[PDB]
Amino acid sequence: NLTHCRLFEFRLCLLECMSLTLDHCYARCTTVITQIHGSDTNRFDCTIFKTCYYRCYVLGKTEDHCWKGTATSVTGDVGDLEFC
Amino acid sequence: NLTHCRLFEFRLCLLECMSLTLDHCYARCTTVITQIHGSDTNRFDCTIFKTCYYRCYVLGKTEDHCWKGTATSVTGDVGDLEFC
């Protein structure tokens, strides 16, 4: 499960950070979320989910649909990096 | 470039954490390094390199070769995850 990843939170932080036109929002939110909730949010399978969603966005430039597709399909296993 | 990523530090922390037989060293090391140096170590390209290196390691379980192979051929572009 990706419960402890606090992924919805990262999504809101990411959208809000970019509304401020801050650089490297992906880094800032990971740091912010780590400082509050720690290692649970940096598990490699959280990283896989975030990379599927964030790659989709830098390339697809939707966010709305990139979250739908990731949250419904990507579970965090190492294999997901090449169909997501 | 990937200098701000402090990747060799992460590589040493992971090796140290694993030699102690602790679980979730990728998370713990990402976390401690975050608490110490911050968002520059969590930029999306650092995550690309870390994923190529760590994926090569869970699948093949070599480490030194996965490190050398990733260090020489991965620069952090979003397109690197196709051939790590």
Author numbering:
A (entry chain A), B (entry chain B): 6 to 89
From the paper:
The venoms of marine cone snails constitute a particularly rich source of peptide toxins, known as conotoxins. Here, we identify the sequence of an unusually large conotoxin, Mu8.1, which defines a new class of conotoxins evolutionarily related to the well-known con-ikot-ikots and 2 additional conotoxin classes not previously described. The crystal structure of recombinant Mu8.1 displays a saposin-like fold and shows structural similarity with con-ikot-ikot. Functional studies demonstrate that Mu8.1 curtails calcium influx in defined classes of murine somatosensory dorsal root ganglion (DRG) neurons. When tested on a variety of recombinantly expressed voltage-gated ion channels, Mu8.1 displayed the highest potency against the R-type (Cav2.3) calcium channel.
To elucidate key structural features of the SLC superfamily, we determined crystal structures of Mu8.1 from 2 different crystal conditions referred to as Mu8.1_38 and 59 at resolutions of 2.33 Å and 2.1 Å, respectively. The asymmetric unit of Mu8.1_38 includes 2 molecules that form a single dimer with an interface equivalent to the one present in the 3 dimers in Mu8.1_59. The disulfide bonds are found primarily within each of these 2 regions. In the second region, Cys61-Cys71 links α3 and α4, and Cys57-Cys89 tethers the C-terminus to α3. The dimer interface is characterized by both hydrophobicity as well as the presence of a water-filled cavity surrounded by the polar residues Thr36, Asn47, Thr52, and Thr56.
